[PDB]
Symmetry: C2
Amino acid sequence: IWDATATLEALGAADVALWIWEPETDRLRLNGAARALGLGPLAPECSSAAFRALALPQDRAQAEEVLKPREPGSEVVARFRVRGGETCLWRGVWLEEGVRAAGVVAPETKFS
Amino acid sequence: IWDATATLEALGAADVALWIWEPETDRLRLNGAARALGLGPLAPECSSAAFRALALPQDRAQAEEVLKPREPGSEVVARFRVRGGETCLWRGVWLEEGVRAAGVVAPETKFS
């Protein structure tokens, strides 16, 4: 079988987190290795303002590429550093139902 | 909050799957975008023999790098094609508890 602990074990092992972005509710949700990735202050849920504030200031254009609304099926690809210094790659898509995006965030030291 | 549907949504959006390998029980478990990745025949759970059989024959040395037992903390990094032709990257680690590994599997068309 598969459960919530299995999800966290695999995410932790990979050093990856999952994210869902809901502009309607101004809620970014994280699950998995958020702390390891420098995203600890944002987890389990944060506002778009909190998200932008954690990005290195010079990387905030790239951070915004995650939050920018897009039509369903639109790829989300972004890379930026947060306070602490580590660069992560965000990859996902705008979903079919609602105006929402979801995906993975990974350390670029392991994923490109 | 975060639940099982949120996990599947984010995994699906990223085109990624999670895996746990338990050599003690000869059980490889998958969760997420297994079908999209060519791993559909293995999901939700398979034997090591089923796993090897799905690899392209010439890629079976690389496939084995996933299943090979290692000491806790040992990185798992492998890349190989399965029947159908698509190349995926497997990244994870041998866990602290038991003799088990876990991680992510991703399409190399998106992740390197």
